[PDB]
């Protein structure tokens, strides 16, 4: 019913302003302050700033690395909250969550204080941003040569998914996909393995796709 | 800014277990504090706020209470789909801040790692960059140490980790730990070691290769 979904980039260049939308629908938006919080990859939960609705002021606050780095605005009409990112880095990798404060049991924030005390009950599900120069591309698959154990290394893709399968289907027992880890470079790797009996080395093939770019792949795993 | 600190940082419960998670704020906060859970690649749901007013829509098996400086989740009792991370908010003045998560997994015995080590392919060097690959297979608890040696020397800094989510059927993990060195680097040494510390290991164990053998 309540919904909210970000848009605005997975790969974005370094240096160039970014915005951020966040469109909202299934309530009445301009009755909600809206707060926007990112998830640097394996890390916690961290506030950048939320914006108050018109009737208290609308003015934003920001967490003390995000004062003027980062602005917020909104157009009610248009049921949107905006994140403005002056200069992104490396740093400002991760998933941006936009989420509204609830109000209370009387359609109401806080008289006394700072008000916003009943929780985000609703987020969207998260757009990943990743500063980096690098472009979309698919994947370089690498053998990862040989009970034993054997597998592929799935290489520098964005963005994600990908799906990878072994033998067509046909070999599922002892197989781990992990998931993807973004490096460096703003590409993301990953490797699929598989334990199989060193007496079987059966012929062994990874079939990995990548439909962003229209990459299948199919490699062969030999000793 | 008001820290918010979560202890543990992870737990082992089984179905129908009681569970008590603790947030612990830098000042005293009375009653506000949120709790989410928040599950992998999903984004955080809301079960409390004001410290102890259960959410409409979240099971009346989760309750919470604090005393201005600690506060405390509890699950009473645990279910399958409540393995996941547990997460508090003060909400008590800006910045908003939360705590660094609390993890909660489903306990089984403890199950030692098969390691095993992966030479980069033939194929990567032609491009210039040599991937070593360290595989942890089938452990419990999730808890690893993975060590990197070239010719004996530690690594630090040139490695990345990945882990799946706890396996449905047996709850173990499995884990892997990628070396990253230009071409040039991977030639000038010989032996690649990777040695896995683990709670079911009686000693550390070492996998590793000699280049080009």
């Known amino acids: 019913a309540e919904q909210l979904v970000e848009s605005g980039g997975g790969l974005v260049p370094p240096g160039r302003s970014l915005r951020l939308s966040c469109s909202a629908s299934g309530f009445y938006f301009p009755d909600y302050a809206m707060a926007w919080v990112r998830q640097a990859p394996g890390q916690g939960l961290q506030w950048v700033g939320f914006m108050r609705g018109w009737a208290y002021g609308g003015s934003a606050q920001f967490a003390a690395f995000a004062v003027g780095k980062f602005a917020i605005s909104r157009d009610d009409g248009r049921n949107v909250v905006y994140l403005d990112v002056k200069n992104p880095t490396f740093e400002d990798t991760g998933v941006y969550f936009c989420?509204?404060?609830?109000?209370?049991?009387?359609?109401?924030?806080?008289?006394?204080?700072?008000?916003?005390?009943?929780?985000?009950?609703?987020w969207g599900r998260g757009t990943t941003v990743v500063v980096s120069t690098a472009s979309t591309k698919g994947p370089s698959v690498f053998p990862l040569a040989p009970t034993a154990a054997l597998g592929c290394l799935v290489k520098d893709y964005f963005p994600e998914p990908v799906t990878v399968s072994w033998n067509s289907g046909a070999l599922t027992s002892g197989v781990h996909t992990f998931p993807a880890v973004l490096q460096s470079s703003g590409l993301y790797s990953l490797s699929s393995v598989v334990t199989v009996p060193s007496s079987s080395l059966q012929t062994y093939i990874c079939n990995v796709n990548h439909k962003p770019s229209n990459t299948k792949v199919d490699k062969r795993v030999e000793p | 800014d008001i820290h918010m600190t979560q202890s543990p940082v992870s737990l082992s419960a089984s179905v129908g277990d009681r569970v008590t998670i603790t947030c612990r704020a830098s000042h005293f906060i009375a009653n506000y504090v949120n709790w989410y859970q928040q599950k992998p690649g999903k984004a955080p749901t809301l079960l409390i706020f004001?410290?102890?007013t259960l959410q409409r829509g979240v099971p009346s098996r989760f309750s919470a209470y604090g005393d201005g400086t600690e506060f405390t989740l509890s699950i009473n009792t645990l279910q399958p789909e409540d393995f996941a991370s547990y997460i508090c908010?003060?909400?008590?003045?800006?910045?908003?801040?939360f705590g660094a998560g609390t993890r909660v997994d489903q306990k089984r015995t403890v199950a030692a790692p098969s390691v095993f080590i992966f030479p980069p392919s033939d194929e990567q060097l032609k491009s210039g960059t040599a991937s070593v690959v360290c595989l942890l297979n089938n452990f419990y608890p999730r808890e690893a140490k993975v060590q990197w040696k070239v010719d004996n020397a530690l690594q630090s800094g040139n490695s990345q980790e990945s882990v799946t989510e706890q396996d449905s059927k047996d709850s173990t993990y499995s884990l892997s730990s990628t070396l990253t060195l230009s071409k040039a680097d991977y030639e000038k040494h010989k032996v690649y070691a990777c040695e896995v510390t683990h709670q079911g290991l009686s000693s550390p164990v070492t996998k590793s290769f000699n280049r080009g053998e």
């Open positions: 004001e410290s102890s």
């Open positions: 989420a509204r404060e609830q109000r209370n049991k009387d359609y109401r924030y806080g008289q006394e204080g700072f008000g916003y005390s009943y929780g985000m009950d609703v």
């Open positions: 908010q003060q909400s008590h003045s800006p910045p908003v801040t």
